[PDB]
From a paper:
CDFs are utilized by MTB to transport iron cations from the bacterial cytoplasm into the magnetosome lumen during nanoparticle biomineralization. Like most CDFs, the magnetosome membrane-associated (Mam) proteins MamB and MamM share a common two-domain architecture consisting of a trans-membrane domain (TMD) and a cytosolic C-terminal domain (CTD). Here we studied magnetite cluster MamB and MamM CTD structures from a phylogenetically distant magnetotactic Deltaproteobacteria species, BW-1 (MamBBW-1 and MamMBW-1). Each MamBBW-1 and MamMBW-1 monomer consists of two alpha-helices and three beta-strands and is folded like-metallochaperone, similar to previous CDF-CTD crystal structures.
To obtain structural and biochemical information, recombinant His-tagged MamBBW-1 and MamMBW-1 CTDs (residues 190–270 and 213–293 respectively) were over- produced in E. coli cells. SAXS results showed that MamBBW-1 scattering curves are similar at concentrations of 1 and 5 mg mL-1, indicating that the molecular dimensions are independent of protein concentration over this concentration range. In contrast to MamMBW-1, MamBBW-1 crystal structure exists as a monomer and does not create the classical V-shape dimer in the crystal, yet superimposition of MamBBW-1 monomers over MamMBW-1 V-shape dimer implies that MamBBW-1 may in high probability form a V-shaped dimer under the right conditions. MamBBW-1 dimerization interface, similarly to all CDF-CTD structures, showed the typical parallel S-shaped backbone structure. Support for such dimerization can be found at the possible interaction between Val235-Pro231 and Ile233-Thr234 from each monomer. Additional support is given by the MamMBW-1 and MamBBW-1 electrostatic potential maps, showing that the top of MamBBW-1 monomer and the top of MamMBW-1 V-shaped dimer have hydrophobic and positive patches, while the lower parts have hydrophobic and negative electrostatic charges. As an alternative, MamBBW-1 different oligomeric state can also be explained by crystal contact and crystallization conditions that break the dimer and create alternative contacts with similar or lower energy. Putative BW-1 C.B is composed of Glu271 (MamMBW-1) or Glu224 (MamBBW-1) from each monomer. Trp269, Val307 (MamMBW-1) and Glu222, Lys260 (MamBBW-1) are also located at the hypothetical metal-binding site but are not predicted to be involved with metal chelation. Overall, based on our analysis, it can be assumed that the composition of amino acids within MamBBW-1 and MamMBW-1 putative metal-binding sites are suitable to coordinate and bind metal ions.
Numbering used by the authors: 187 to 270
The structure:
C-alpha cells in the first residue's frame, strides 16, 4: 500500500518532467526489502542514444529520491505515438 503512494508521487514527477512525453506504464513489486520498479516512458521519436541514456539516469534519480528504501529501477523508452 505504501507502494501505491510511491507510484503516485513518481507519476506526478514524471508527468512534469519535460524530457518525457508521457508515462506509458509504472510497475512496482517487492523483492524482500527491495522495491523493484519497471518504468516505461514515451519520448520523442528522434532522441539520440546519449539523450536516452541521460533520461534513464534522470528517472533513476527521481525514484531514488522519492523512495526511502532500497530499490532497483528498470527504464524502457518508447517512441511517442504520432498523429497519422
Amino acid at each position: 500500500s505504501h507502494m501505491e503512494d510511491y507510484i503516485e508521487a513518481i507519476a506526478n514527477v514524471l508527468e512534469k518532467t519535460p524530457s518525457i512525453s508521457d508515462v506509458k506504464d509504472i510497475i512496482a513489486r517487492e523483492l524482500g526489502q527491495v522495491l523493484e520498479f519497471e518504468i516505461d516512458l514515451y519520448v520523442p521519436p528522434d532522441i539520440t542514444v546519449t539523450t536516452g541514456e541521460r533520461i534513464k539516469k534522470e528517472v533513476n534519480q527521481i525514484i531514488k529520491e522519492i523512495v526511502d528504501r532500497k530499490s532497483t529501477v528498470k527504464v524502457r523508452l518508447f517512441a511517442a505515438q504520432e498523429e497519422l
